[PDB]
DNA sequence: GGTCACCAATCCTGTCCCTAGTGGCCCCACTGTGGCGGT
């Protein structure tokens, strides 16, 4: 699964019709987040889900925050955001309601967010998830 | 990234005229398109 996801990162710049900060995640990686088995049960994460996210944590690690956009500025939708947090979709809308998670362009007053349109950056959606500590994080070892 | 602030207001007092008048002349198309009983 790592080597399958490694070629998509190396050949990310090849596929670009627009800039990284304007392109969606499913345009480069393709369905690999919303196909993943859900963690609605117990808050017990799937071994497929543990392996996917732990690759994305080292992606933003290798792609620091510079003035040129890179692979860590790909746009993520509210459903793909809901899976990466492992919570309900209303709970992730409520974080948007109290401006905890910051969209990536301003909707103009009658814009209610399309649930499939890529709203948030991959970047700080991960950093929000690393603000919550669970036992098998890479920080301790 | 996107919109074009709310809260109330439209003035009262007086009047539109008087005089005189709307022309003469000539003309308004020829063709066709009838049924029925009788001497």
């Amino acid at each position: 699964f790592n080597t399958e996801l490694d070629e998509l990162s190396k050949n990310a710049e090849m596929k670009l019709i627009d800039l990284f900060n304007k392109t969606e995640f499913k345009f480069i990686f393709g369905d690999a987040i919303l196909a993943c088995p859900s963690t609605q049960k117990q808050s017990e994460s799937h071994f497929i889900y543990r392996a996917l996210l732990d690759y994305l944590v080292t992606l933003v690690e290798s792609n620091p925050k510079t003035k040129k956009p890179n692979a860590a500025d790909l746009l993520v939708s509210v459903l793909e955001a809901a899976t990466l947090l492992g919570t309900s979709v209303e709970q992730v809308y409520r974080l948007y309601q109290n401006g905890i998670l910051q969209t990536a362009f301003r909707h103009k007053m009658n814009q209610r967010i399309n649930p499939y349109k890529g709203a948030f950056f991959l970047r700080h959606v991960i950093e929000y998830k690393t603000s919550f500590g669970n036992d098998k994080a890479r920080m301790y070892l």
Side-chain angles (χ1 to χ4, degrees), chain A residues 9 20-21 23-26 29 33 52-53 55-61 63 65 70-77 80-81 83-85 101-104 118-130:
Chain A
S9 294
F20 276 111
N21 53 317
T23 51
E24 286 177 315
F25 194 79
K26 68 176 60 144
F29 285 95
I33 305 221
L52 167 66
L53 148 102
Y55 174 70
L56 296 179
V57 168
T58 190
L59 184 60
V60 302
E61 197 279 310
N63 294 321
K65 292 89 188 194
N70 54 45
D73 295 295
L74 291 172
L75 298 212
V76 170
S77 194
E80 282 120 270
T83 54
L84 285 170
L85 293 217
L101 272 295
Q102 218 45 54
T103 157
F120 315 114
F121 291 99
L122 187 90
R123 202 175 283 293
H124 54 249
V125 128
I126 280 173
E127 272 92 84
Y128 186 72
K129 194 61 187 302
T130 65

Side-chain angles (χ1 to χ4, degrees), chain A residues 3-137:
Chain A
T3 55
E4 190 166 344
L5 285 171
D6 281 316
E7 49 91 350
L8 294 172
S9 294
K10 289 179 290 189
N11 307 349
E13 193 113 60
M14 300 301 98
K15 287 175 197 172
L16 287 181
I17 63 176
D18 214 316
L19 329 177
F20 276 111
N21 53 317
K22 298 296 183 179
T23 51
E24 286 177 315
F25 194 79
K26 68 176 60 144
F27 184 80
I28 300 299
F29 285 95
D31 175 55
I33 305 221
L34 55 137
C36 190
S38 292
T39 177
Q40 85 294 346
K41 62 164 235 279
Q42 198 270 296
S43 195
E44 224 164 38
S45 349
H46 206 272
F47 82 97
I48 294 165
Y49 175 78
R50 280 162 188 165
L52 167 66
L53 148 102
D54 284 12
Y55 174 70
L56 296 179
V57 168
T58 190
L59 184 60
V60 302
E61 197 279 310
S62 59
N63 294 321
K65 292 89 188 194
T66 201
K67 209 95 151 177
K68 171 225 48 156
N70 54 45
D73 295 295
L74 291 172
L75 298 212
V76 170
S77 194
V78 255
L79 279 168
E80 282 120 270
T83 54
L84 285 170
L85 293 217
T87 54
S88 67
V89 99
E90 172 52 35
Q91 182 59 33
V92 106
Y93 291 147
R94 218 280 308 122
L95 291 180
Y96 171 80
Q97 228 315 114
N98 291 59
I100 306 298
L101 272 295
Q102 218 45 54
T103 157
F105 40 73
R106 236 306 146 239
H107 101 287
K108 248 13 292 266
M109 216 73 115
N110 268 345
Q111 216 289 315
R112 215 314 203 135
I113 355 177
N114 183 29
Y116 311 98
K117 193 212 131 323
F120 315 114
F121 291 99
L122 187 90
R123 202 175 283 293
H124 54 249
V125 128
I126 280 173
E127 272 92 84
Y128 186 72
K129 194 61 187 302
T130 65
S131 75
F132 292 81
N134 71 325
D135 305 350
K136 308 189 210 215

